[PDB]
Amino acid sequence: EXXKXXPPXV
């Protein structure tokens, strides 16, 4: 969740 993004369930 939030920030840059990246992998799932962030």
| Distance from C-alpha of 2 to C-alpha of 8, rounded to nearest angstrom | 11
Give yes or no for a contact between 8 and 1, defined as CB atoms under 8 angstroms apart: no
| Distance from C-alpha of 9 to C-alpha of 1, rounded to nearest angstrom | 6
| Resolution of this deposited model, Å | 1.1
Q: Which two tokens stand for residue 1?
A: 């969740």
Give the number of residues written for the chain: 10
Query: DSSP secondary-structure letter at 9?
Result: -
| Distance from C-alpha of 8 to C-alpha of 3, rounded to nearest angstrom | 13
| Distance from C-alpha of 10 to C-alpha of 3, rounded to nearest angstrom | 8
Q: Is 9 exposed, middle or buried (0-12, 13-18, 19+ CB in 10 A)?
A: exposed
